[PDB]
Subunit: 111 residues, 3 copies
């Protein structure tokens, strides 16, 4: 029975999560399965998955993951992209797709 | 013998099996913990032979400490074991993991405070 | 029987790959398998395995692997070693064994 489908995002967080599209202009949208995947991934990399539960938990993860980005595989970048959106959701920063999330994260990063 | 378990000498296993995992708790360290730590090290692509010496463990802890604040329970357990393992090699008598960690940065403190 | 070996080295790079020896004065030499292995080794470490197809790709993987090298396991150093030779091949640097390859990588760094 239940797992990380309940501890990472709140109900309202969740309903905004399942409206965000994976690729800009695309058809497919984040589901619970991506959150489960990301949490199990974090522990397979020895990172604390509880950090997914808060906006700075993810801020910390993304800081630790980013230097691996250039050389990272498709798996790494998906994990990072998912955690970027989770950050957007925890911050209540409205996003339409993954791309807009990385954008807003860099804009917040420039100031 | 035992391949991964022999990082400790016969005498070191004797004090090893006396050190409590958590302070005031009664469960203690066993072979299963060293075997586990070794296997975890090579699962993080680190050389398990480093557990054989005080500075093998010194090097491992330095390589792991950056990952500690965001690390998972398995990484903190690994660090804690290697911390205790370092104190055993160093003949530093400790009673639980907390003591091992506490002395660990007394070492890491004086290293920096006479450097400065 | 799927490939993943013609993606990394060209046919002529392959002919020189297969003359490099694993160790100086040694008898054993690099083979296709060393590249298959290196490639899956990079996906298990979360790295993009396409970076092996270009010298620039390898140059970067080496940079991000070097820090782990002092405390790294036998498995890590063999990955690093294999990719160091891959680099010189891509770079048209001629080496006879893993040691020469590692040395030249050293002086570049
Ligand atoms: O993206 P919109 O142009 O805004 O239009 C709608 C809509 O938005 P409205 O609230 O204005 O009706 C719904 O979002 P919800 O009310 O359900 O929260 C939604 O409706 P249904 O899925 O129930 O049909 C659905 O898609 P989704 O929930 O998958 O985002 C869809 O968005 P799209 O127009 O992009 O399909
Ligand atoms: O004589 P030992 O066989 O070596 O056993 C004693 C002890 O009793 P004493 O007061 O007579 O010394 C405890 O036994 P327990 O009640 O806790 O169940 C304790 O035993 P533990 O091993 O379980 O802690 C401790 O044992 P040790 O230090 O070996 O871990 C210690 O042994 P030492 O006096 O030799 O240190
Ligand atoms: O045509 P061959 O005289 O038989 O030459 C080859 C070959 O040389 P070429 O393919 O270029 O002609 C290699 O030696 P090198 O050219 O690098 O010096 C080879 O060794 P490899 O397995 O690394 O290719 C080996 O010479 P060796 O006995 O040193 O291994 C071998 O000659 P043989 O097939 O007669 O052994």
């Amino acid at each position: 029975s239940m797992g990380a489908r309940a501890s990472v995002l709140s109900g309202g967080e969740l309903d905004k999560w399942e409206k965000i599209r994976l690729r800009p202009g695309g058809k497919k949208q984040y589901k619970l399965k991506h959150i489960v995947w990301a949490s199990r991934e974090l522990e397979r990399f020895a990172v604390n998955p509880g950090l997914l539960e808060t906006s700075e938990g993810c801020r910390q993860i993304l800081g630790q993951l980013q230097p691996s980005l250039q050389t990272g595989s498709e798996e790494l970048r998906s994990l990072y992209n998912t955690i970027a959106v989770l950050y957007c959701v925890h911050q209540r920063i409205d996003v339409k797709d993954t791309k807009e999330a990385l954008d807003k994260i860099e804009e917040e990063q420039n100031k």
